[PDB]
Amino acid sequence: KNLLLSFFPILEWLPKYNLKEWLLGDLIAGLTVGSLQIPQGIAFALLAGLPPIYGLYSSFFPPLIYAFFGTSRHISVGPFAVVSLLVGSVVERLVPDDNGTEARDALRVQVAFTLTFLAGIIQLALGLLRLGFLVDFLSEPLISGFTTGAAIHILLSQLKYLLGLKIPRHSGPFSVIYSVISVFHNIPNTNIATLGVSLLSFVLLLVVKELNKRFKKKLPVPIPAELIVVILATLISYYFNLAEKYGVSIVGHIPKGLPPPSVPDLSLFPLVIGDAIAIAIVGLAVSISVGKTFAKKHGYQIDGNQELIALGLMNIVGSFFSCYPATGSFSRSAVNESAGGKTQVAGIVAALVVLLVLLFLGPLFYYLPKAVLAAIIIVNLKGLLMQFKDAPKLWKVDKLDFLIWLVTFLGVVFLSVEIGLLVGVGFSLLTVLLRTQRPRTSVLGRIPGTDIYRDVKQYPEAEEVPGVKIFRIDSPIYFANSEYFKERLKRKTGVDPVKVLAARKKALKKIVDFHTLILDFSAVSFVDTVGVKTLKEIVKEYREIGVQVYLAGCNASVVEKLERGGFFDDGITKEHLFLSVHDAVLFAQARKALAEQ
Amino acid sequence: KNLLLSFFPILEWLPKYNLKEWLLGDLIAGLTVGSLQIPQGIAFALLAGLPPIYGLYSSFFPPLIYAFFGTSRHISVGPFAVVSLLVGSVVERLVPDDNGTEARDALRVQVAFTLTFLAGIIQLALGLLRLGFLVDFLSEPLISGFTTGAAIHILLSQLKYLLGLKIPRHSGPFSVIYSVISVFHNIPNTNIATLGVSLLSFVLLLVVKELNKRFKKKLPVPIPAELIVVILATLISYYFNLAEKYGVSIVGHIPKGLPPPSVPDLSLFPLVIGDAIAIAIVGLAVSISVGKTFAKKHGYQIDGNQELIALGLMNIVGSFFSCYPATGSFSRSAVNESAGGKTQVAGIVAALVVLLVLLFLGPLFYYLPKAVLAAIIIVNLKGLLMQFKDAPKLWKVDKLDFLIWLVTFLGVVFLSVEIGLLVGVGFSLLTVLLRTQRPRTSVLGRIPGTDIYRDVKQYPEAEEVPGVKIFRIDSPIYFANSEYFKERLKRKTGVDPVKVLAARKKALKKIVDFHTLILDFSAVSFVDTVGVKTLKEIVKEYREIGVQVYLAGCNASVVEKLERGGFFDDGITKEHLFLSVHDAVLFAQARKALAEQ
Numbered sequence A, B: 001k002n003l004l005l006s007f008f009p010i011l012e013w014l015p016k017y018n019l020k021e022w023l024l025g026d027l028i029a030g031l032t033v034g035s036l037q038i039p040q041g042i043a044f045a046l047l048a049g050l051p052p053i054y055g056l057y058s059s060f061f062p063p064l065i066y067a068f069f070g071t072s073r074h075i076s077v078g079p080f081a082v083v084s085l086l087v088g089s090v091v092e093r094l095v096p097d098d099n100g101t102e103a104r105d106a107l108r109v110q111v112a113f114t115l116t117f118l119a120g121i122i123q124l125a126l127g128l129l130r131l132g133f134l135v136d137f138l139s140e141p142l143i144s145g146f147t148t149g150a151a152i153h154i155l156l157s158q159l160k161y162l163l164g165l166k167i168p169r170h171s172g173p174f175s176v177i178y179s180v181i182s183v184f185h186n187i188p189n190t191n192i193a194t195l196g197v198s199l200l201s202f203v204l205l206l207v208v209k210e211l212n213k214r215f216k217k218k219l220p221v222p223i224p225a226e227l228i229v230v231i232l233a234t235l236i237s238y239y240f241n242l243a244e245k246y247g248v249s250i251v252g253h254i255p256k257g258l259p260p261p262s263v264p265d266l267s268l269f270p271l272v273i274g275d276a277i278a279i280a281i282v283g284l285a286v287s288i289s290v291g292k293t294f295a296k297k298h299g300y301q302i303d304g305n306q307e308l309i310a311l312g313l314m315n316i317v318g319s320f321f322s323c324y325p326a327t328g329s330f331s332r333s334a335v336n337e338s339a340g341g342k343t344q345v346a347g348i349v350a351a352l353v354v355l356l357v358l359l360f361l362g363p364l365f366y367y368l369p370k371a372v373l374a375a376i377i378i379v380n381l382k383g384l385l386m387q388f389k390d391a392p393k394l395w396k397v398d399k400l401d402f403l404i405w406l407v408t409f410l411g412v413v414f415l416s417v418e419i420g421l422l423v424g425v426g427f428s429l430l431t432v433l434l435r436t437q438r439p440r441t442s443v444l445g446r447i448p449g450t451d452i453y454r455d456v457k458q459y460p461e462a463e464e465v466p467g468v469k470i471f472r473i474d475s476p477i478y479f480a481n482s483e484y485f486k487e488r489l490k491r492k493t494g495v496d497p498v499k500v501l502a503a504r505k506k507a508l509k510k511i512v513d514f515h516t517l518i519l520d521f522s523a524v525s526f527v528d529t530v531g532v533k534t535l536k537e538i539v540k541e542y543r544e545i546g547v548q549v550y551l552a553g554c555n556a557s558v559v560e561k562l563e564r565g566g567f568f569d570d571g572i573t574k575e576h577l578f579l580s581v582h583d584a585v586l587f588a589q590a591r592k593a594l595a596e597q
Ligand SMILES: CCCCCCCC/C=C/CCCCCCCC(=O)O[C@H](COC(=O)CCCCCCCCCCCCCCC)COP(=O)([O-])OCC[N+](C)(C)C
Pocket: A126, A134, A135, A281, A284, B438
């Protein structure tokens, strides 16, 4: 049925695939992105603490399962920097670095699989419960700040491998600080051959990227920079024999064959559930952003709920077949699009490229120096570091949107990467309250010879009507701004009804300008519980000094809430609800005349 | 100067004190409230873990120092149940129950003094920084829930002393549950003589309270119930010798003489700063509520800032002279008023009554059974338990105000009393966002033969103007509700400008009803940063399909924010800001006519 085809998009979009103007483009794109996934795969695997094959596994399985369940047409899923950073934190925290290496690595990969499992389950859940609207609450400033912060950590991590130092470090509170000073202390312990192969690597990378960018096409497929750098460097470190002589650290044994089916031991569930929640939220945020970017630009739509289901299935399947959490990324996605990716056929093609390297090529990457992997990670990190361009832009336009960006970024650099995200998100939510908490109240008068009413301060043309004081709040009346409203009503109408009643009673036991306040509720989007209580109070007080309160403006839902909340018995009737300020004004004047006689 | 007289209110209100119609009333009230403070003082001291004299000290010093710095005229400050509960938690947590007794008691009273100190400093601070407006954010449902929850704990605590069991218990997560089952297990270990003196005590208390309530005045001063019950019971337990024979636990030695000046050792500052923050916030909340209640009822005003300074000075002085945190309370305050309290002279008088009992009477309360103290605490707790009457009231009117009450109460009973308060307060703040997050949007039309515009669904009379679509949100446009606004604008105007541009471009590369949207911003109280960005987007999209967007309504502050945020260059000019929907409608129609020719 339509349910089965919507819960497995492949069965809808694959039959309609036109093999003539697309298949060429998707195969080019697949080869381009596979050439990119192999080096980065292994890189991002080291950054995460796991052995190097996990990057090849994470680059093979995820993109397939997403091709099946996925709605986006330009996203490439796989191992991406920030998630790898988060997985790494948890691994090295639950398995410190202290036969021995294989024992530690076995426990490491078990922690990884638990993280992948839980992160997939959370994402799957959210998508089944149709809570995919909550990925809108993750502002773009929030996510810019968080990814830029996380790229500062990932840059500092890869300095140690790039020089050849053997520094231990942490990801805990203020860890970047003592990590950078740790590297400044140990810079005399620099391996010189490791700095050699690092700088050689960067030179070849920038040369090939600039060359294939500026120089002539003469190619259906672009020049794969990272691949050829890994290849030249592994050959150089095998011939000149860097590993054993000069002491340059190399990638270990990469085992041949398909992944082994494994089981995430949920014995570690209470240790890792917190960081699995952070992985899951980061993954959704980044992947769905990218989905939406390319969907907007190419004139189609993604479903946020089906996207959550797809990413969750991909992680859970992967958890079973020896992977770590994948996600989409704007880099691979841009590369996949610029190469001429049209469907998820490109994802399937790229995964077959990683498959043939898992199976055959395999242990030729024995003599690959870890410095060439660190250099690849630093040149990929350009993307996220160029987002510092966004702190001035936000600054100019909206300063609360610039604070979301700064709080999140500082929170991520100079505390934890989990805590950064949490504090950022909280601040993001609070900015809506700070926008609505001192709203813009006004006293309105009639423009002469027109039956429109506008602010009397801002439009000096407008004159107040005799006997009728009209006031207009331009916000919801809720818990955040309701005391304020009642204050500003008593200050801009120039009357406090309880003080006036006190003076009247004092004078009567010893022995106001207006007869009608019209509240214009055109901009009251909603009222909550405190709101209805505050409006009850205002009406009761102004009944006591003998002033009718008419509402002129109320939307349907605000009238229904006022009614449930019991606003329509204490003096006010539903016949004091008018459509526009004018209709209330007329009615007010008329009652006054008919009562004069 | 006026500063010195406002920073020491006594120097203003004391000279003007008329000695003829007031001094009698205040002396009656002072004696009534002192008769109440002695038994309760000692009671609340046991409830807090400290030795019994601390209640007499806390009943003597605080009321004096508040008389000097205080603005309220009917509040009585002193030891009150809920704060004593909180101090007790911290004491027995930092000093578990395991020569030995004096050593433990010395460390106990040191913890107490640190709490009093810090709580006074926090309250003093808040009042100097003029942050006394933040005590408005503490809803009445919040505080009803929290005090009712805390009275459940205080009732369960005093069951053990009332029967004679020797149960240990905690205040940690779900502690009420295992505390009640602990008492159900150990009910066979009931002392029978202790249950005797408990039930005797309650009988005498209810008899004397009912008697002096219903029966004839024949008295300038009411009958002090708690005092005469403590007196009869101590004499009974001395004559019949309950302590040694039948094993009834008694109050220890009450030492004679004034307090010793002490120093709160801030060596414990990092252990107790969290609970000192809870003490401080509870104290302010309760004391200032009461201040405001009696100020409203008697036709004067308190300053919230001067109240914070007064309560903080009182706690800091007291911390030095061997006290534990005091606060106002509605019970003593009601007793002080009903007796005929007119000024803080009543507080000074009551403190002299406690002074003469500290000095002289003193160790006659050796043979006082602790069961008579527990019974006094249970009959005083009536006050706070009758607030369960507030959960149905809130239920009827506002269900979000009923949730604030329930979340806080359940949070306090079935988790910690600190955590209850925190969760309650958070929920309280979030309810304002939930009120304003799906506001009431409308499309407005002109009432025929009137120049007022109101909802076309709710007022079927109103007709839309040709060419002009008028929409009105009734809320702030901030982070919480801004995506919603833009959705409902495209749904109720029946046009999506980006889809319309896409269709137009598709048709043009192969080869809407209106010309003007008027947003009525009369109820937009405020706009925040996300708000200005969302309004930029709407205007830019509707410029692209060739529809002018006019704003008709905006208050001063919303126009200034739109201007800073850069809203007034991307198509919109400040001449598209009108006063009322009518003036915009006229201008819209007119432009359309003048362009037809
Ligand atoms: C993605 C990254 C982030 C991670 C995700 C984080 C996830 C965060 C999750 C967030 C949750 C978000 C969901 C809320 C949706 C809003 C819609 C809404 O509530 O409208 C209402 C329906 O809803 C209700 O009112 C139903 C309430 C009943 C439920 C409790 C009963 C249990 C009783 C005992 C339970 C005891 C159990 C004990 C167990 C120990 C409709 O209301 P209405 O009448 O139309 O008028 C109101 C005004 N509006 C709504 C119209 C504006």
